[PDB]
Amino acid sequence: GRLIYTAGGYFRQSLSYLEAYNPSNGSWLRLADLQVPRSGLAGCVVGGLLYAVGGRNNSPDGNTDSSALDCYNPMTNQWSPCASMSVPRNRIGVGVIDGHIYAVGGSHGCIHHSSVERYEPERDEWHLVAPMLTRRIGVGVAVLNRLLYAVGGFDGTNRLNSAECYYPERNEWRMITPMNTIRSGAGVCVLHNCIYAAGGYDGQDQLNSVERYDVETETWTFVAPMRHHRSALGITVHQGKIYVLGGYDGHTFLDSVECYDPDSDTWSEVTRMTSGRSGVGVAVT
Numbered sequence: 611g612r613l614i615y616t617a618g619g620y621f622r623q624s625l626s627y628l629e630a631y632n633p634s635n636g637s638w639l640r641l642a643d644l645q646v647p648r649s650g651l652a653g654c655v656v657g658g659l660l661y662a663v664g665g666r667n668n669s670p671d672g673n674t675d676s677s678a679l680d681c682y683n684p685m686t687n688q689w690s691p692c693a694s695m696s697v698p699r700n701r702i703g704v705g706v707i708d709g710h711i712y713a714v715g716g717s718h719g720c721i722h723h724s725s726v727e728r729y730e731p732e733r734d735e736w737h738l739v740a741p742m743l744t745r746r747i748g749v750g751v752a753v754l755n756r757l758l759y760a761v762g763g764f765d766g767t768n769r770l771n772s773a774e775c776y777y778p779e780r781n782e783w784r785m786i787t788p789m790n791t792i793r794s795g796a797g798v799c800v801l802h803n804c805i806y807a808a809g810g811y812d813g814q815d816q817l818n819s820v821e822r823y824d825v826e827t828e829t830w831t832f833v834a835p836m837r838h839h840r841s842a843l844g845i846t847v848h849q850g851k852i853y854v855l856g857g858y859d860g861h862t863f864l865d866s867v868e869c870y871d872p873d874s875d876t877w878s879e880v881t882r883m884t885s886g887r888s889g890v891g892v893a894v895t
């Protein structure tokens with residue numbers, strides 16, 4: 611694609627923002643608000659459309675977890691409701707394989723899901739697939755080699771360094787090598803055939819460390835840390851670089867956006883969001 615979209619988020623309450631960043635010229639676009647505020651949601655893109663999945667409305671009047679799927683068309687600057695999920699999923703992870711959206715884990719009240727469901731845009735229908743081996747909220751999701759990876763999270767009692775791999779053709783999950791660090795609320799993405807896990811919360815502190823998984827060596831290796839510690843950060847890849855957006859550093863809701871260059875193994879700051887926030891959904895189109 612060519613813009614980095616960021617939807618929703620949290621600062622004092624759940625937010626309705628849809629904004630877009632153009633890395634070519636540094637401009638920020640203010641686009642149509644979400645119809646209902648939400649934080650702890652995920653963003654993805656299928657066929658030029660942006661989707662906002664799951665999350666929760668943390669408001670002064672109450673907190674309501676979201677089963678919603680909403681569809682944003684950049685050509686009309688309009689959000690439309692799509693079919694809701696089987697269950698609300700706050701602190702959800704999502705990935706896309708073959709034009710289908712996978713909604714992974716997340717929470718509904720105190721229920722920590724291990725369930726996974728798959729959306730087909732052509733039918734506007736969700737179906738459950740095989741559940742993960744582990745309940746995971748605050749989970750990161752990456753898609754690599756047409757496999758779906760669920761990384762880290764919190765199972766309701768244990769904060770996780772574990773990760774597992776979903777095989778869509780076989781409809782089954784397998785545990786993979788765990789991370790070096792316990793991480794919930796990390797940003798997880800794929801860049802140049804590796805799975806990156808950036809930031810998160812290890813049970814003691816928000817993290818600035820970043821590690822990556824090589825699927826053939828089956829090993830996780832640390833790379834350069836971020837400039838800021840961040841949990842519930844947004845993450846995406848744009849032109850061979852990772853972008854991380856906002857998150858909570860333990861004290862402030864960050865407006866910082868950093869960019870990771872894999873060739874030089876360096877982070878740098880590229881822009882600031884218009885306001886500090888955490889728990890956003892991010893995608894590129």
Ligand SMILES: CCOc1ccc(S(=O)(=O)Nc2cc(CC(=O)n3cccc3)c(NS(=O)(=O)c3ccc(OCC)cc3)c3ccccc23)cc1
Binds near residue numbers: 650888890
């Ligand atoms: C003063 C901070 O205020 C806020 C309010 C609201 C937010 S949010 O809108 O982004 N939603 C989220 C909250 C939490 C959890 C969280 O931080 N809070 C904060 C208030 C209530 C929950 C998560 N998981 S986590 O990062 O793994 C994590 C981090 C810290 C933890 O313990 C600290 C002792 C436990 C888990 C999340 C993971 C993914 C996506 C969203 C998350 C963020 C911060």
